[PDB]
Structures are given as C-alpha cells and as structure tokens.
Amino acid sequence: KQCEIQAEQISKEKEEAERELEAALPALRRAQEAVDSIESKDIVELKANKKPLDIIKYIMDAVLVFFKARLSYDESGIQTLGDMNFMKKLKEFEKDSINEETIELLEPYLNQSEFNDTFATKASKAAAGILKWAFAIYEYHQKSKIVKPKRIQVAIAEGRQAIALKE
C-alpha cells in the first residue's frame, strides 16, 4: 500500500512539475532561440559606437552583473564582448547560478517604463532577445527553490517505489 500511495503521489507530482515546466521554460527557450538567431553584424556595429544609448546601457549593466563582471564602465563591457568565446557563452550560462542578493539588487533596477521588447527592438535589432532571456531568468528564480524539494521528492519516490517492490 505504500507502493500504491507512492505511485499515485509520483504521478501527481510529475504532472504538477510538467505543468510548471510548460508554464516557465518555453519563454526561456524562445528567448534563447531568438538570441542564437541574432546576426553578428548588429552586435559588431553597436560595439564600435562612440557612446551607448540609455536603454542599451541600462540592460547591459544587469547583463554584465550576471556575468560576474560587476563593472559599470562601457570599456569593460567592450572588452568583455571583444572575445569571440562570448558567442558560445551566450548559451552556456544556467539559471541555478543566480544568487538571491543579485535578484534583490536587480529588482529595483528593472525600469518598468524603459524595459519592453517592442519598444526596445526599434533601438537595436539584437537588443530585443536578451531582454526576454533575462526575464525568463528572473521569472524562474524563487520558483526553482520551490520545485527543488518537489524534484528531489519525485526522484526519491520513484527509487523508493522500486525498492519497496523488491522488498
């Protein structure tokens, strides 16, 4: 009867986890696909600009903060973008690396009048993707914390059901 109850609980927990994943992850997947589709011409042209725009600077500050390069100097961002390995690093960073203090500091910096995909696309074609990607990171932090006990419980419940059948 523990096998029966745990089978039902595993089914319910897996359904809930799949629903949460369908709710959250596809935004990140679409943002990452859009980022991968960005041509190098736009980034190269914007890198050589004499001065940065307000919206681009504001988003780039948070983007560099996420990359552990906590520097507000535009030259630092130019140096970071100079390396070609950044093209790989766009698809390498994960969401679990986010810290609670980082989100707490970035939440005030989220300028509601300024951030918007449609309005920001006019300023630069490449700027549109990164925004949503960051949001899918900010809209997944504090939910991975909620799902982590659920994920662990699902794995342990499946294993324990198998061991219980053997016993």
Q: CA-to-CA distance for 58 and 114, rounded, in angstroms?
A: 9
In angstroms, the CA 74 to CA 89 distance is: 19
Question: What resolution in angstrom units was achieved for this structure?
Answer: 8.8
From residue 53, alpha-carbon distances to 1, 41, 47, 59, 112 in Å are 64, 18, 12, 10, 17
| Gapped junctions in the chain, after residues (C–N > 2.5 Å) | none
Is 141 in contact with 95 (CB distance < 8 Å)?
yes
For residues 43 and 41, what is the distance between their CA atoms, to the nearest angstrom?
Answer: 6
Contact 81, 43 (CB under 8 A): yes
Is-contact 106 67, C-beta < 8 A?
Answer: no
Angle between helices 40-47 and 74-82 (to 10 degrees): 140
Q: Are 41 and 124 in contact (CB under 8 A)?
A: no
Do 68 and 139 form a contact (C-beta atoms < 8 A)? no
**Residue written as token pair 């918007």:** 116
Q: CA neighbours within 13 Å on the CB side: how many for 58? A: 15
H-state helical runs in 37-98: 40-47, 54-66, 74-82, 86-89
CB atoms within 10 A of CB 34: 17
Cα torsion angle, 74, 79, 84, 88, sign: negative
**Residue 32, Cβ neighbours under 10 Å: how many?**
16
Question: Which two tokens mark 97?
Answer: 């690396």
Helix (H) or strand (E) holding 79: helix 74-82
| CA 79/CA 110 separation, integer angstroms | 25
Are residues 74 and 58 in contact, defined by beta-carbon separation less than 8 angstroms? no
